[PDB]
Structures are given as C-alpha cells and as structure tokens.
Amino acid sequence: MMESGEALLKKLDGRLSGLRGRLTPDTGMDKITWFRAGGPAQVLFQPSDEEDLSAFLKAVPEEIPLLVVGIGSNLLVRDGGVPGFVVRLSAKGFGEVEQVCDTQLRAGAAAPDKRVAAAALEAGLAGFHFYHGIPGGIGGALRMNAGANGVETRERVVEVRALDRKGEVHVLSNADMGYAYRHSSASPDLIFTSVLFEGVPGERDDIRRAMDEVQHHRETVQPVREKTGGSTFKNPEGTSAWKEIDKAGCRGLRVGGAQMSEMHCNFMINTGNATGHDLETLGETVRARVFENSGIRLHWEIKRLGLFREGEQIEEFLGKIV
Ligand SMILES: Cc1cc2nc3c(=O)[nH]c(=O)nc-3n(C[C@H](O)[C@H](O)[C@H](O)COP(=O)(O)OP(=O)(O)OC[C@H]3O[C@@H](n4cnc5c(N)ncnc54)[C@H](O)[C@@H]3O)c2cc1C
Ligand SMILES: C=C(O[C@H]1[C@H](O)[C@@H](CO)O[C@H](OP(=O)(O)OP(=O)(O)OC[C@H]2O[C@@H](n3ccc(=O)[nH]c3=O)[C@H](O)[C@@H]2O)[C@@H]1NC(C)=O)C(=O)O
C-alpha cells in the first residue's frame, strides 16, 4: 500500500545528491495541512531557493508524480497518502515581501498572505487588506485566485514567475493566468516562485481600518481558529452554501472526528482525531442531503487529494446520484 519514501529515494540514486533543500520521507500530510488529517506523502521536498527547485525538477523524471503545496489550507488529503514527491517551498527562500517602487510589491510564493497585508500597509497601498484574513500562502492565492471581502487575487497580480516541470523559468502575466472565480488557467505543471503586485496608493489610517474590519469579520463569523480548510462548497447562484446546508439540517453533522461547524456551516472541522475519510464522507454526506433537500448539487471548493485506503472508497454524493 504505497512504497515507502526510502524506496523512492533509492531508485533515484545520485540524481538527487547535490540538492540543498531537505528531503523527508513518509511525512504525514496531517502535519502540513490545516485539517490536520491525511496520509503519508512518499517524500516531502523543501527547496532552499528557486535554483534548488529548478535543479530538483531537472533531476526527477516525469513519470514520478509531483504536487506543490503551500500552507495546505485548501487541501483534504486522503488517508492512503500521496505518491511521488510533495514540494513545499522554503519560507526563507520564497517568503520575501519587498516594495519595488511606490505602487508595487514583490512577494515570493511561500510568503503568507498576511505578510502581504502588512507590507502594503507599510507602503500605503490599498486593496491588500483581504490577504489579512486568508491564512494561506501567496503560491496558493495565485493558483486559487484567492479572494474575500469583494477583492480577488487577480486584481492585484501584475506578473507571475514560475518554473515548469523541466525547470525552465516562465514570467507570465495577469492575462496569461486566465483568472475566474477561484480559478486560474495557468498550466498545472507550473510552480509559482514569486509575483509582482500593484495596488492604488492610499491613506494608512484607512488601510488599518479595512484590515481591522477584515479581521473582525473572521473572528466573529468564521471558525478560523480551528482545523479546517475554510469554505467547503461554492455558494450556489441565488443562494449560499451555508444556508442550503443549514436547511438540509446539517449544522453540527458529524462523521467520526469531523463535524460541520455549528458557527458557520460551510466549514468542516476536525474536532481532534478526524481521518481524511471522515472529512470527505461528511462533505459528500452534506452534498447528498442538500441535493435531496433542494436539488442543488454542491461544488467542492477544497481540493480532495491522495488515495483511499483499501476498501475505503467514497462515492460523490455517497452514490445516491452521479
Ligand atoms: C480559515 C480559512 C479561511 C479561508 N479563507 C479563504 C478566503 O477568504 N478566500 C479563499 O479564496 N480561500 C480561503 N481559504 C482557502 C485557502 O486559504 C486558499 O485556497 C489558499 O489559496 C490556499 O493556500 P495554501 O498556502 O494553503 O495552499 P495549499 O492549500 O497548500 O494549496 C492550494 C493550491 O495552491 C497550489 N500552490 C501552492 N503553492 C504553489 C506554488 N508555489 N506553485 C504552484 N501552485 C502552488 C497547490 O498546487 C494547490 O492547487 C481559507 C482557508 C481557511 C482554513
Ligand atoms: C472562506 C472562504 O471564502 C469566503 C469568504 O471568506 C467570505 C468573504 O468575506 O464570503 C464567502 O463566504 P460566505 O458566503 O459564507 O460569507 P460570510 O461572511 O463568511 O457569512 C455570510 C453571512 O452569513 C452569516 N452566517 C454564515 C454561516 C452560518 O452558519 N450562520 C450565519 O449566520 C454570517 O454571519 C455572514 O453575515 C466565501 N465563501 C464562498 C463559498 O465563496 C474560502 O474560499 O475558503
């Protein structure tokens, strides 16, 4: 049931020597995702700088699956784990946030969104206050077109810099990203390394205000101190997920260690010892009950990921529809 990371590293004898970032086998993905659940990643790699990454992409052959993660705040990992390599870029190497002129910011892809919030305040730049509430990283924001409070990532993105699976650099633009609701059209083999941001200059007392209103909303209406991946499902047109969920009677619904948050019922909470199966079963149990109650088929906003354990597959909607 999944070869160990040892065996992966042993087949890759010598082609990985000369890499400076850490190579950790069999790292649970519960150690690295906000849900605090999931199975083993065969090998975790944490490149030191863009060139450690580029070297590691030139080194690993294409048949081995690669997955890039940031803070793992949008991932539901299954209890069977993730084959191949999992890449989490280094904070020290890819977390820098600096001002370049008077309207623009450059941020490495590992930089937490909240660091880009503070950096814009320290530069008098409006429109970055929505990163103050999103606990993810800038690499996932660019990929998920992350957004809140009526602002999305797409509106502050100037140009993005990435590596492809052959380790060759790509400077891509806001148009190339192909942005939509929680979506980018950029190739999925691309690894974002940094981005150039641009906001309209503004008064700092205002930027504070918006950031304090952003944070007050989070602390008051969302369970953002819990182990969760955030908003489970997209809001259906003309209504909202949490509502259609509460209507189906699902506020507080439990599967094992997983619960639908009684505070905000589009959030799934690991109350301590939830498995990956617990969370995907709750989600698809809610999908099933909301469809039956409203005919609305909910769309996942959290990425499900990895392998089921033997005899532990889950059918979308629990097999009730297809
Ligand atoms: C309390 C809470 C509140 C949230 N609020 C919001 C919100 O308001 N708006 C919102 O949109 N989301 C929200 N989320 C979801 C989550 O924060 C975002 O989806 C975010 O984009 C994920 O960031 P991450 O660092 O956790 O990335 P991960 O979860 O690790 O990965 C998410 C995606 O980003 C990709 N990715 C990450 N880094 C790179 C990279 N360097 N190169 C290429 N691809 C990369 C991964 O491949 C994956 O597809 C919330 C989550 C929580 C737990
Ligand atoms: C968290 C995410 O994005 C969030 C984002 O934080 C906020 C923007 O502030 O609006 C969306 O949530 P949302 O539609 O539930 O808006 P919220 O502000 O969180 O709550 C909506 C309103 O209904 C109230 N509310 C919500 C849930 C509940 O169980 N009870 C309740 O009373 C809240 O008090 C609030 O007044 C995004 N969710 C989706 C599916 O689009 C994410 O993508 O992971």
UniProtKB/Swiss-Prot annotation:
Family matches, as InterPro entries: FAD-bd_PCMH (IPR016166), FAD-bd_PCMH-like_sf (IPR036318), FAD-bd_PCMH_sub1 (IPR016167), FAD-bd_PCMH_sub2 (IPR016169), MurB (IPR003170), MurB_C (IPR011601), MurB_C_sf (IPR036635), Oxid_FAD_bind_N (IPR006094)
Single GO molecular function: UDP-N-acetylmuramate dehydrogenase activity
Primary location: cytoplasm
GO cellular component: cytosol
Catalytic-site annotation from UniProt: 182, 231, 301
Cofactor: FAD
Residue span(s) of domain FAD-binding PCMH-type: 36-202
Cellular localization per UniProt: Cytoplasm
Pfam families: FAD_binding_4, MurB_C
E.C. no: 1.3.1.98
Catalytic activity entry: UDP-N-acetyl-alpha-D-muramate + NADP(+) = UDP-N-acetyl-3-O-(1-carboxyvinyl)-alpha-D-glucosamine + NADPH + H(+)
Sorted UniProt keywords: Cell cycle, Cell division, Cell shape, Cell wall biogenesis/degradation, Cytoplasm, FAD, Flavoprotein, NADP, Oxidoreductase, Peptidoglycan synthesis
BP terms from Gene Ontology: cell division; cell wall organization; peptidoglycan biosynthetic process; regulation of cell shape
Family annotation (NCBIfam families): murB (TIGR00179), PRK13905.1 (NF010480)
PANTHER family reported for this sequence: UDP-N-ACETYLENOLPYRUVOYLGLUCOSAMINE REDUCTASE
HAMAP family: MurB
UniProt record similarity statement: Belongs to the MurB family.
Protein's UniProt name: UDP-N-acetylenolpyruvoylglucosamine reductase
Protein's organism: Brucella ovis (strain ATCC 25840 / 63/290 / NCTC 10512)
